[PDB]
Amino acid sequence: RDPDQLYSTLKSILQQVKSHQSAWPFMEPVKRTEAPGYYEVIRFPMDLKTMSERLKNRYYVSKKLFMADLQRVFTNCKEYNPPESEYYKCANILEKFFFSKIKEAGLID
Ligand SMILES: COc1cccc2onc(N)c12
Fold first, then answer.
1. Residue 41, Cβ density class (10 Å: 0-12 exposed, 13-18 middle, ≥19 buried)
2. What's the rounded Cα separation, in Å, for the pair 15 and 101?
3. Disulfide: which of 20, 21, 59, 67 matches 54 by Cβ 3.0-4.6 Å?
4. Coiled-coil region(s) at which residues?
5. How many whole angstroms from 10 Cα to the centroid of ligand 1?
6. Measured from the CA of 34, which atom of ligand 1 is nearest?
7. Residue ranges per structural domain of the chain
8. Cα 68 to chain center, whole Å?
9. What is the dihedral of CA 73, 96, 66, 50, to 10 degrees?
10. Which atom of ligand 1 has the smallest separation from the CA of 76?
11. Hey, which of 28, 30, 41, 78 would you mutate to test ligand 1's pocket, going by the most ligand atoms within 8 Å of its Cβ?
């Protein structure tokens, strides 16, 4: 069940990330109205709702595709927001959590 092993593992990892107390800024797409100039600077927006959909839609056929999207959630945030903002802080906390979980799961060697 090599496809469903991957799916299972990713779903677990994604749920844990979504349940984390620092995930709240990333739960839905950034709104243009709340972020002036966001979509002019961030070319590939990503969020955890979209990732959930992608997962359900069987898009994440490799660990690399999953990693790229979730990494993008953090890097987008860090480019856009000031370094001591609450959003920037949440990104790094959640990113630390993400790297531990992917290492825990044996997704990167
Ligand atoms: C509440 O989410 C936001 C609102 C406005 C700007 C944002 O940048 N990164 C975010 N996660 C974000």
1. exposed
2. 11
3. 59
4. none
5. 24
6. 5
7. 1-109
8. 8
9. -40
10. 9
11. 30
Residues with beta carbon inside 6 Å of ligand 1?
A: 25-26, 30, 34-35, 77, 80-81, 87
Three-point CA angle 95, 100, 102, nearest 5°: 95
Best of 77, 78, 79, 88 to mutate for ligand 1, by most ligand atoms within 8 A of CB?
77
Closest ligand 1 atom, CA of 80? 8
Six-digit token pair at 37? 């100039």
- Supply the DSSP symbol for 33: T
Atom of ligand 1 nearest to the CA of 91: 11
User: Are 88 and 95 contacting, i.e. CB atoms less than 8 angstroms apart?
Assistant: no
Name the phi and psi angles at 92, rounded to 5.
-70, -35
The type of residue at 34 is: E
Q: What is the resolution of this structure in A?
A: 2.1
